C-alpha cells in the first residue's frame, strides 16, 4: 500500500522552470532518504537527485547540480524537485522513488560506525511525471498516405498506411477505419527529428484485391493542436 | 564516479529455460557495513521499475525464487531459473555504494521463437507532401525475428547518411515478432535531384541482402 505519485511535468522552454512533487501514501516519510530518477525517451534510467530523512542531506548527478533543487516536506509527506535553467537533455520521465529502508541523521557520538548519512537501493517507484524540454512550438500534423502499389504488394497481400509528419508535441493517436480495423495494424513509436518536431507512421497489411472494394481511413487525433484528420488512403 | 557494465545488452529467451544476466562494476561494491549495495530491478514496458532482488542476493518480498542473485565485489549476476514468458522486458543493476547512484546499460529481455524473415515494402512520397516541399520515402520491415535488422538507404545507388530514422514496434504477444519503419527525408529539389531510391535490407532470414526499390515519378 505504499505509494509515490509525481505531478508537475509538462512542456518547457529550454531556460525556463518547473516544478514537480511526489506525494506519498502508507510508510512514516520522515524516516525514509528519498530519490529523483529520470529516464529519457527509449533510454536507460539516470539517478537525479537524493535527499535524506531529514532533509539536512541532499545529493545531485553532475548533469543537473547547480541548476535542480531537491527539498521535502515532512509535515506535508511531499518530495519535491525544482528544476531550472532547463536544458533540451532534461527530457525524460521522472519518478519518485523511496529508499528501500529506514535510515536517520549519523551518530558523531556514543559509537563510530558512520558520521554521515547513508543511502541504499530504492524499493517503491512512482508512475513518473513528463517534462519535455523544447524550443518548438505546438503544430498540428500532416498527414501524409503511404499508398498501396506494386511496391507494397506480394502474393495478394499489400501494405498501405499513414505517415503523421512534423507535429508537436506529443502524442498523437491513430486508428483505421474509426478503430474497427486492427487486423495487420502496426503504429511505430513516434521519432523526434532534427528539426524538433515528431514524426510517425501507422501500417497496415490488406488483401490487394480490396484497394478497390474497401475503403481505408486513418482517424489522426492531435489533441494538442485540436486536430482531427480523417486521411482516405488510396492507391495512386 | 562507479560505472556499471551489464551484459548481454540483449537476450531472446525460450521459455522454461534458463536466462543469466551480468553486472560488472569498475570497483568494489563491497561497504564498511559488510553489505555489498547492488540491486537488480525489472522493467515491463510502459510501466515502472520494479525491485527484484537486493543487496546482492535478497529477492524483494513478493518475487518469486526463480530469481536467484549471486556475486561479490565487482562481479554479480541474476539467473532466471525457469524463465516464463511474463518475463519480458528490460533489467537493469544498480550500484548505491557511493554517489551518483548508477545503472547499468540494462539488458532486454524478448522471447526466442523460429527465424522469420521480413516482408520488405517501400513508400515514394506522396504528391501532396511534395507539394509542400518536402519528401519522405519510408520503408516498412514487416513481423520479422531476430529483432537484428539493418536497413540502409541508397540513392542512385549512393549511401545515405544522417538522414534517415528508424523505429520498432515491440514484441508482438501473439507470433513474437517485430516490425520497423525507417523514413528518409530530404528536400523536394534534393528528391527531384535522383531517380532510383532503394531500402536495401539485411536479417539472418534473409540468405541475401534484399533490396526494394523504385523510381521517382513512376
Known amino acids: 500500500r505504499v505509494q509515490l505519485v509525481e505531478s508537475g511535468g509538462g512542456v518547457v522552454q529550454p531556460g525556463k522552470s518547473v516544478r514537480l512533487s511526489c506525494v506519498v501514501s502508507?510508510?512514516?516519510?520522515?524516516?525514509?532518504?528519498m530519490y529523483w530518477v529520470r529516464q529519457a525517451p527509449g533510454k536507460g534510467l539516470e539517478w537525479v537527485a537524493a535527499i535524506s530523512g531529514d532533509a539536512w542531506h541532499v545529493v545531485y548527478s553532475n548533469s543537473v547540480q547547480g541548476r535542480f533543487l531537491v527539498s521535502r516536506d515532512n509535515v506535508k509527506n511531499t518530495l519535491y524537485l525544482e528544476m531550472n535553467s532547463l536544458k533540451i537533455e532534461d527530457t525524460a520521465v521522472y519518478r519518485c522513488?523511496?529508499?528501500?529502508?529506514?535510515?536517520?541523521?549519523?551518530?558523531?557520538?556514543?559509537?563510530?560506525?558512520?558520521?554521515?548519512?547513508?543511502?541504499?537501493?530504492?524499493?517503491?517507484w512512482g508512475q513518473g511525471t513528463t517534462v519535455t524540454v523544447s524550443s518548438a512550438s505546438t503544430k498540428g500534423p500532416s498527414v501524409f498516405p503511404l499508398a498501396p502499389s506494386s511496391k507494397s504488394t506480394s502474393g495478394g497481400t499489400a501494405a498501405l498506411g499513414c505517415l503523421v509528419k512534423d507535429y508537436f508535441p506529443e502524442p498523437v493517436t491513430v486508428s483505421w477505419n474509426s478503430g474497427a480495423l486492427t487486423s495487420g495494424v502496426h503504429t511505430f513509436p513516434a521519432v523526434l527529428q532534427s528539426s524538433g518536431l515528431y514524426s510517425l507512421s501507422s501500417v497496415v497489411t490488406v488483401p490487394s484485391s480490396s484497394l478497390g472494394t474497401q475503403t481505408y481511413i486513418c482517424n489522426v487525433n492531435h489533441k494538442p493542436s485540436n486536430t482531427k484528420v480523417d486521411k482516405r488512403v488510396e492507391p495512386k | 564516479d562507479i560505472v556499471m557494465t551489464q551484459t548481454p545488452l540483449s537476450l531472446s529467451v525460450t521459455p522454461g529455460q534458463p536466462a543469466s544476466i551480468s553486472c560488472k562494476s569498475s570497483?568494489?561494491?563491497?561497504?564498511?557495513?559488510?553489505?555489498?549495495?547492488l540491486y537488480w530491478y525489472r522493467q515491463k514496458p510502459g510501466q515502472s521499475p520494479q525491485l527484484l532482488v537486493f543487496?546482492?542476493?535478497n529477492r524483494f518480498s513478493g518475487v518469486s525464487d526463480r530469481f536467484v542473485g549471486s556475486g561479490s565485489g565487482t562481479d554479480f549476476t541474476l539467473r532466471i531459473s525457469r524463465v516464463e514468458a511474463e518475463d519480458v522486458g528490460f533489467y537493469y543493476c544498480?550500484?548505491?555504494?557511493?554517489?551518483?547512484?548508477?545503472f547499468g546499460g540494462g539488458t532486454k529481455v524478448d522471447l526466442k521463437r523460429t527465424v522469420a524473415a521480413p516482408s520488405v515494402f517501400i513508400f515514394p512520397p506522396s504528391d501532396e507532401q511534395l507539394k509542400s516541399g518536402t519528401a519522405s520515402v519510408v520503408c516498412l520491415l514487416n513481423n520479422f525475428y531476430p529483432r537484428e535488422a539493418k536497413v540502409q538507404w541508397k540513392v542512385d545507388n549512393a549511401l545515405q547518411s544522417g538522414n534517415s530514422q528508424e523505429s520498432v514496434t515491440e514484441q508482438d504477444s501473439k507470433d513474437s515478432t517485430y516490425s520497423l519503419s525507417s523514413t528518409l527525408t530530404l528536400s523536394k529539389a534534393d528528391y527531384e535531384k535522383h531517380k532510383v531510391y532503394a531500402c536495401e535490407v539485411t536479417h539472418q532470414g534473409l540468405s541475401s541482402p534484399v533490396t526494394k526499390s523504385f523510381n521517382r515519378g513512376e
Open positions: 502508507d510508510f512514516p516519510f520522515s524516516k525514509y532518504p
Open positions: 570497483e568494489s561494491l563491497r561497504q564498511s557495513n559488510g553489505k555489498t549495495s
Open positions: 522513488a523511496r529508499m528501500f529502508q529506514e535510515s536517520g541523521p549519523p551518530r558523531l557520538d556514543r559509537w563510530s560506525g558512520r558520521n554521515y548519512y547513508y543511502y541504499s537501493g530504492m524499493d517503491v
Open positions: 544498480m550500484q548505491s555504494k557511493d554517489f551518483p547512484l548508477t
Open positions: 543487496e546482492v542476493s
